[PDB]
Each structure stands twice: as C-alpha cells, then as structure tokens.
Design a protein around this ligand. Structure first.
Ligand SMILES: [K+]
Ligand SMILES: [K+]
Lengths: 317, 317, 317, 317, 168
C-alpha cells in the first residue's frame, strides 16, 4: 500500500551509508552517487574501486531494480483498477455547476443538444443507457436515482438544475421526494406521464412540471375534424419553421422602464405578439392596458427570427 | 491533459539554466548535459563538481523521474481507454470504399465469404452479434442502424455499397429511408421478408430488392407433386454443383461489337444458354433476333464451368 | 512461465565470462561490469577497447533489452490477468475472522451499516449484485452459495459468523445444510420467509432464525382497529426514536454479583425495564423474585439513551 | 504494424553514420557508440566534443526515446488486445491430445473430476458457462458447437475423444453429424435424453451412447414396491460405497493366456463376479464354459476394493 | 399445497423437481405431513445424496452422477458403458430381473453352492436381498428364506426357467 516510499527511502539511506562508510567520500558525495546510480545515469565520476564496494554496487543495483519493479506494478494496478471502475460508473461527481439528468429516455436526448457535453451527468442504472450516453457525449454515473444514498454520488446538493425523467410516475415522484430531502433550493424539472399525477409532482416539490403525453392526447382528439391548433403548436414549439416562441429580458434602463403596454405598443412597432410578461416567477398572460414595465421583467412573445432581432433592439438602451 | 509538453519543457529549461549559471559552461554544453541526463545516459563528461551542483543534480533527476512517471501513466490511461472503447464499438469509421452491412442475420453471413474481412463494417446493436462478427472476420461498429445520427458513424456517405438486412420490414424500410437522407447516390441492397413490402422497399429508395422468403414459399408449394423448378433453382443458384449463372462483360472491340444474336449464335458455338443481355441498368430477357450487341453490355447465361471459360474466350479480342 | 530467471541468469553468466575471457579482467570485475551494464548504468570505468569486445558489448546489450522486453510483458500479462479475474470474483478468501453474507437482499444491506467494509464477503451469483456490493463498500466473491465446492472459496470454515439470506426458503435450507457440512462450530444466522419453515431452519442447523415477514404479517392484522403493539415494535426496534432495546453485560465483580432482582431493583433505580437475563445461551424472560445474578450474565432491557448510560454505571465496579 | 523494425534500423543506421562522418571514428566505433547510447548506457568513452555533434547527440537521443515510446505502446496494445480477446474465448486450440466437451451440464461436471484441468476444452456459447468452467479448472473456447466452422476452432480433428452433452436431442444429433464430417476416426460419447433418440444417436455416428434419464425412469417405476435393483445400481455405479465395477486388462503372458473360465475359476479364487469379457469391441456377457482367454482381453467384474487388488495379482505374470 | 395431492396415505411419492434445493425442501415437507410414506427422490449433484438421505428419503436415484462417471471411463476403454446401456437402459438382450422366492418352493433351507442357480438356469446371481439389505455376492454359508428377492441378470428365455425352477 504505502510501502513504496518506505522501500525507496530505505534503499536510498542504504546506498548513502554504503558508499560513505566504504569508499570514504563525503555524505554529499554519497547522496549524489546513490541518486545518480539509482536512476541508472552512471556518471562514472565516483565509481567504486574497492572489491567489496565492487560487489556492493551489484546489490544496490538489484535493490533499485526491485523498487522499480514494485512501484511500476503498483502504479499499473492502480491505473487499471481506476480505468476499469470509472468506465462502468461507480465514480463520484466533483463538479459544482453541473446538470443531473436522472433516468434516460427520448425526451432527455433532445435536452443534450441545447447544453454542453461534459456539463451533464446522466444518473441511470441500466446497461445500454451507458452506451447511449457515451455516444451522446454526456457522462454516465451508475446508480439508482430513487436511492438517497445514490443521489449524493451525483452531487445533487451542488447542482445547477436537475431533470427527472424515469420509466413511470411512481419512480418520478420518489426521485423528486428524494431530491427534496438533500437540497431544498435546487431546481427540479419533472416529466409527468399521466394527467392525474401533475398535482402530485407539484406537491412533492417539483419546480416545473412538463407533461408531453397530456398535450399529445389533447392535440390528437382535437385534430380529427380540422386540426388547426395542432399546426400552431407544432410549427411554433416543435420545429420552429417560420416562427419562434422567445423570452427576451429587459435590462437596466432599457429606454422603456416604466412605460405601459399602451404607450410601448410592441406589436405594431416590432411585430412580435406579446403573450405575457414574466413579473417575478409568475406569468401574467396578456397584461392589461395599465400594466407598467419594470427592470428584470421577461417578455414572452411569438415572432419570426427577424422580428425577434428587431425587438431585441427596441428594448436595449 | 496537455501538461506533458509543459512539464517536459519546464524541466528542460530548468536544467539548462541550472547547469549554465552554476557550472559556468556554455549554453550548448548545458543543453547537451540536461538532454543526456534526463534520458539517464550519463556520459560523465560534464559531471558537476561543485557541492551545490552536486545536490542540484539530485533534484533534476527526481524531476525527470516525475515527468517519466506522469507521461507513462497518461499514455497508459489513453491506450487502455482506447482499447476498451474501440473493442465494444463506439468507434468512427474512416474508410472510403468499405461495405456497410446494417443488421446481422444468416443471409449476411453468406455475403462475407465473397468479400474481404477488413473491408466490411457490420452496424448492429445487439451483443452476441459483436462476437459473431469478430469470429467471422469482419469489423463491428456499435450503433442503431435506424438512427441517422448513427449511420454517419459508419460513414455511409462514402461507402461503396450498403446491405440492409434487419429483424423486420419496418426496420428495413426505416433504415433505407435514413440512408437515402444522407447520400442519394450510394447503392442499397435490401432484403424483403414479406411479399407486400417489395414495392415499399422499391419506393423508399432501394436499388435492389431481394426476397428469399417469397422465393422459398413459391418453391415449396410448387414442389409437392413433382418438384422440377426447385431442382433447377437449387442446383443453379444455391449449390452450383454442375451449372452456374454467370454475367460476362463485353470489352472494347471484342470481335463481336455490333453483331446480332442470329449471327453471333452464342449457344451453338460456346454452349451457354443466353438468358438476357444487360443493356445499361435494364434487363432484356431473351433479346430478339434483331438486337445488336454493343460495348459495355453484360451477357447473362447458364453454363458449366468449362463452357463459361469457352465463352470468355469467344468474346475477347 | 519460469524462464525469466533462466534467461536472466543465462545472460548474466554469458556477460561475465564474455568480459573475463576477452578483456582479461578479474571475475569480480567482470561480474561488476555485467551488472552495471545490464542495468544501463554505464560507469565507463571498464569500457571494452578491443574491437571484438567492442562488438560483443552490442550483443550483450541487445540480449539485455530482450530480457527486459520479455520480463516486462510477462509481468504485465500476469497483472492484467489478475486484475481482470479478481474484479469479477473468481478469487479465494484468505481472511480468518471475516463475516460471510450468502445471498443479497435489502435485509442484508442494513447489516453492513453496523459492521466494517473490508470485513464482510458477499457470496452471490448474480451480476447487478456485484455492483451493488462494490457500491456498499463490501467485497464480492462470485460463486453459488448452495454448492459446497463454492462455500470453501469464501473460507466458511474459518469465519466469524455467516448470514444466510437467499431468494427462497429452499435455497436457505440447502445453504444451511451445506455450511453445517464444512464447519460444525460456525455461527449461522438465517432469515425465514414463510412461517412453516422456521422449524426446518432450526432443525437444519441454524443458530438463530429471524423471520421478518411473519412479524410484519402479525403486526398488519393486529393494527387495523387500534395499532398499539405496532407502535411499540416500530419505535423500539426499527427507528430507535426515543427508546432502545439494549443488552448490557455484567463484568467480574460488578458490585452486584449474587444479589437478587428484589434487592437490586434495577427499574426503580436506573429506569430501565428489565425484560430478561441472558443466563448462558438461554433467555429467562422476566426472571422471578428469587433469581440471583452472576458473572457473565447479559441483562436485556428497554430504556432511553440516558437511562442506558445510567445503568451501565450502576453495574460497573 | 511492422514499422517497429523499420524505425529501429533507421535510427541505428542514422546514428552510425552520424558519428562516423562527424567525429571521424571507425565504423565499428560508431556502431558501438550508437548501441551504447540508444540503450542509455552511456559509457562516456567516445563522448562527442564537436559542438555540432554536441547538438546531434540530442536529436539521436530524442529519436531513440521516440522509438522506445512507439514500441512500448505497440507491445502494450498487442498484449492488452490478446488478454482481452483470449479471456472471453475467441481463441484457437493448438493441442493434439485434448478432450473436447461440447455443451455444459451437470453430467459433464462429474467427468472433470476424473481428468486433468488443462487437458479439456469446453466448447459452449453461453456466458455463465464461461465462469463455471473457469471455476472448475477447465479451458473455455467460445463458439457454437453445432456450426462446423466452430468445431474446427477447438481442433476436433486432432482430439483424443469428444463428449457431446447439449440442451436437447436435436442439438446433440446435429453436433454428432457435424463432428462426423470433420474426422471419421475420433471417438464420440453422446448423452441421449429421450429413449426414442438412442437409435438416432447410434445411426448419426456416435461411438458410445449414454442415457441417464432412461435409467432413472426405469429405476423409479421399479422401486415403488421393493426397490432392490435400485440399491445395486446406486451402491455399485454411483457411490462405490462397498463395491466397484472394474475392468482389468490382461497383459502379454499373464499366466492364464489360453485357459478356459472353468479352469481359471476367477470367482472362487479371487472373489470378483465375472460379468463378461471384452473381446475386441464387443461384450460377451457371461462367457460360456468353453470360452478361452487371450491377450488384450478386458475382464469386467464387480468386487470390493480388496478383491480387485487380489485379482490384479492373479492375472499378472 | 401437498395436502391437496393427498401425500398422506399413498403408495410412493416420486420427488423430481427442477433443482436440488427444491427437492430437499419438498422431502422435508413430505416428512412433516406423513412420516411413513415412501419417497423416491432424484439427486442432481453428487454432494446432495447424503443430504437427501438424511432429510427422510428412502431411495435416492442419482442418474447424473452415473452418466458423469460413465463419460470419463469410456474416453479410452469404453466397455462398462456398453454393459450398462445394454442391461439397464435399453434391455436389448439381457435385462436385470428381481424375482421373489414364494413360500415352500424348492429352496427353503438350501445353501447357495447346492442351489446351483447359474448353471441350471443361466442367470447371474448378483445379490440376494432380505429386509431392505441387499447382500451382494452371497457367501456359501447362506440359506434361502421364503420372502427373499433374488436379483439376477439373464435373458428373457432364462428368467422363465428361473421362475419355474424356484416354483413349488
Ligand atoms: K540508463
Ligand atoms: K558514464
């Protein structure tokens, strides 16, 4: 274990005294000689001439080769064990601003194309998930996301945001309850499968609850006859073909801090339909004619990629 | 990561100045000394005699051993990671004239005995398929053949020909549609399982559609009473016991460029039954008595391995 | 296999005689020269000047490099084989006071938080059990716990205590019968699943038989109306919220060796309800008013963590 | 691939000429110098003094370190690839008197306790079979035993005897048919499961056909009332508690070559019941009173381990 | 659940399960229900024969150990497997037979040397069994009792002469 330093210093203190009290040179010269011989340098400036030292150099050399044959094998054992343990998970995350994506599905493969590669840590248990993650460019941390003793290996206490997407609703609720036990302040984003579980995911402690299956089942039964709201939803949120739903922040100053929506008149000026303003963690959809803008607000609107650029210029100062 | 070169050049520029401004030798001599000491050569032609340098050589040697203990471990980590990642797939193909065989079945094990070993790249997802491929002498590229983000890892854009054979017809149609999205010019060869899917495989964009199950089911229900066409099909296409179905090209000149089949009279001269001629990506089965041969044609015929040699001599010039 | 020492001594005895009977130096000088050259030290104090020796040093050096290229590869093959075999089990336990936990379940994950990490050896056959054990901090020994040829690899003959917990009752009974064939003295602790198998586990040779499912099924059907005994059982044995069931031993002397429970009066003095005394591998629950304490007894009682400390002071001498 | 020797000889022929046509020493001296420098020996007997050579030694040393960094990495890649491929099968057997045990069951674990460990080669396809074989002390050769292209990897053409025991009767018949296609002379020993397949296994080409299930089903239905033949079969063939069924060969001479069973009288002399004599690949059970012994015969008898020793002395000469 | 198949009061219970631990447990259960019924187990491994005997079984038939021993003896020589396969398994020409000695039938009070069974009938007297104890290789100082079961290896033509010769 720790005997590498022991054997090294033992061989060194052996060679030092062996040259000092045999060849009769100074302590400094003996230290220099053992440090230029133990490294197989061989300057030949202080070669031993006494036959006893002429045999003693042999045992010094074989001891040095023994130390170099034990330290190399120990380092290689350590490296192989680390590269075989870290490859199949079993490693502890040490980052401080990473994103933990519990579970793995298709809905979490479309959230790795808007983030970085080494910034996310998929926390799943299956096997093929490991290969899929390594293909997608993320990091894989083996463990059961429902076990609180495994959510600390991904360092969920110091995470930027957690994205929960598991195989059912029971596992999602349990993972949310487990995360809310470690850090009360982390931001959780869950995926509700059934409709009756959205209130459960909100009570358990999720900050945002997305439900793709409910939206899909509500658009399938309303697009049988005509199918118009499906076209808007698709061509705005899914593909972003000709439109885009954007949220533009308002900076300090901004040349419109304090003006009402009547006098601002964002639609007839920039061409972006104003859905609602994000006044501090609550959405006021279609703000009335008396709402006055402020600093730090977030305007939510639909517009072409040209009108969004024409809007981000009207709000800057 | 990149600190290997940093530490190496740091130790080198350290030893150079350390010998120059202590032993008082030239810059060239100091560079030579640090490059013959850092490699444990030890010429002993410029050994330090000053006690301060007599201790300084020790720290130079231990720094060199530290660099050789960090570079070796980094190279070994890299090599182990590469040999453990490349073994189980996860590698990108870099060839430019290879053959990609999506999926794996028995019908694609009989197409590896008429090709090379390192020229094919099986693109499958299962586990046992990897061992079967490594036994058959091919290369294994892990990935889902239906995902367009995985068909680019096998480099299907610069492939010679692609052979699609999957577990169903839905996966075959989807893989063909995925391949036709990357490169419009690559040659696809699909295997249709059901009869009703041959037109689907032809519409999706396959260049050649083979259907073994349809042929088998048509030969099984026609070989109950007598079973003669089954004998021809088997002993011509499957085993090649006494006959063989060959396609012989016509070169420039060829001593028969322009002659009609009446005057050529290939059967009564060579003994090979002329099924049809391959005039430019269309098969004219049993060409009429007025068809005139050209250059670049491909004659399709049945004959013994002796009559094929007697025919390949009649068409050469 | 063993040819490393052969080749090393062959090269050494080759170089010794080669320098002795060519350069004409003493046997000691030749041994010193081959031992400072084979290690690439190069003192240069006895460099060969004869052209024949000037070529002979070349073959000595290439032979030495060959030995260093065969010994390194053999050591690396051995180390890789050991680190790849030991990782997935297949190793023999050599300890002498370890705890063998046959099988793996949840009831054996709560017994690894009251023991050490390197002191236990989980003996299971499944795959995911290996990763769970390596996460829990224990050691994994691959093998089938029911096979007597596999119970000797965990060294059950020299174990401190064995904890049997398998997937059924048949496997538990068979593992107990297998353990009682190797060592008659080892202490077995089984987990009975069904009620009708407790007498079977006691007859087969188990020393202690725990049945969690029987207790759970007896507390579930008695806690429908009121549910009071469930509260006692839970808040005493499971959570230890405000109480704790402790067993305190009596040492030599102890200031109460020989007194009756009437005169001792442990409850009204310390505040710990005396359930029973452990007189030598038999439990006398509620000892009568005439039972006299002795040395080596074990008092079993319920009390707060303060009353337990007030009791462990009343019994010491 | 093969560029190791190329780079080595290139660096050597570079250093030789570089020292010869710069320092002006002989060709032999230059060869000696490059061979004592490329190995980091550093005798210092021919150190370069010209500044141009004083810089040239640097490039020689860095080229040597480059060769030692490419050869080490190539050797390590080769060794890791071999130890990772050979571990999971995929290797070709090269022995010439080994025993191939196709398939794996319990009936082939009791035939590894009467053979050696490194003499057998289990040829199976499953995964857990590999670990079971490596525990039992045998060698594992991955492959499908029914495929003729996989029976040649175990070298069934030069095997001592093959033992077929698979999961069904269809696989056993197919494996026997596959083995009889490679080598007509090898000795096959099959295990018939159903009764109706014994004649099939004998026709397919098996040399010996054992059927444990037929014997078990015939002893189960005859041991309901009394159960005596079951006792004989068990306590003679299975456990060998007090008896043993032995086959003793007759050597040249043997002091009874030519005598009839009447005059030999083996039972009343040695105490071993004579079941039958093995006259040349046919069993004559209960030879008549006129059968005359010969050389090379094999006597089959039941007797205690003392009577077998008393018989092996009566037949020797 | 064994109380549904009426394991109490039956001729014999033939225990043959998919594993060995289940066999041991089923035997232990049957011995809890009925303490006198006849059990005929079947051991898979060799180390589990003493276990099945101590659990309460009466006759343990282990075919896998038999086949595993015959698979290693027939690699080079291969003669005992022939006898086993031609006697116990297929019964091609010679089959193992057990015949009881009826009351007062030509044998009450006669030794073996003057019984001369092998020479007048043709069967091979392997062993005679009285009281659940098979006496293999009976000694010359042994008398026949009406109730012993004679075990023998003989052709179907000689078993008849044996059953007639030991008749009243
Ligand atoms: K060196
Ligand atoms: K030197």
């Amino acid at each position: 274990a720790t005997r590498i330093l022991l054997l090294v210093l033992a061989v060194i203190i052996y060679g030092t005294a062996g040259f000092h009290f045999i060849e009769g040179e100074s302590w400094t010269v003996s230290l220099y000689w053992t440090f230029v011989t133990i490294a197989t340098v061989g300057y030949g400036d202080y070669s031993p001439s006494t036959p006893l030292g002429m045999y003693f150099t042999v045992t010094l050399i074989v001891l040095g080769i023994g130390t170099f044959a034990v330290a190399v094998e120990r380092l290689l054992e350590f490296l192989i064990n680390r590269e075989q343990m870290k490859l199949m998970g079993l490693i502890d995350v040490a980052k401080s601003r990473h994103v933990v994506i519990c579970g793995w599905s298709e809905s979490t493969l479309e959230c790795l194309r808007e983030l970085r590669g080494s910034e996310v840590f998929v926390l799943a248990e299956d096997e093929n998930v490991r290969k899929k993650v390594l293909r997608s460019g993320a990091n894989f941390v083996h463990g059961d996301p429902t076990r609180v003793s495994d959510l600390e290996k991904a360092n969920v206490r110091g995470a930027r945001a957690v994205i929960v997407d598991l195989e059912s609703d029971s596992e999602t609720i349990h993972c949310i309850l487990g995360i809310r036990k470690i850090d009360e302040s982390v931001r959780i984003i869950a995926e509700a499968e059934r409709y009756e579980n959205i209130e459960q995911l909100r009570m358990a402690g999720a900050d945002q609850v997305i439900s793709p299956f409910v939206i899909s089942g509500r658009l399938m039964s309303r697009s049988i006859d005509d199918g118009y709201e499906a076209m808007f939803v698709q061509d705005v949120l899914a593909e972003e073909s000709t439109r885009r739903m954007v949220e533009v922040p308002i900076p300090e100053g901004s040349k419109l801090e304090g003006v009402s929506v009547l006098d601002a008149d964002i639609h007839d000026v920039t061409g972006v339909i104003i859905i609602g303003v994000g006044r501090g963690d609550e959405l006021i959809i279609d703000p009335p004619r008396d709402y006055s803008f402020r600093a730090g607000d977030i305007i939510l609107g639909i517009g072409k990629p040209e009108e969004i650029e024409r809007l981000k210029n009207y709000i800057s100062a």
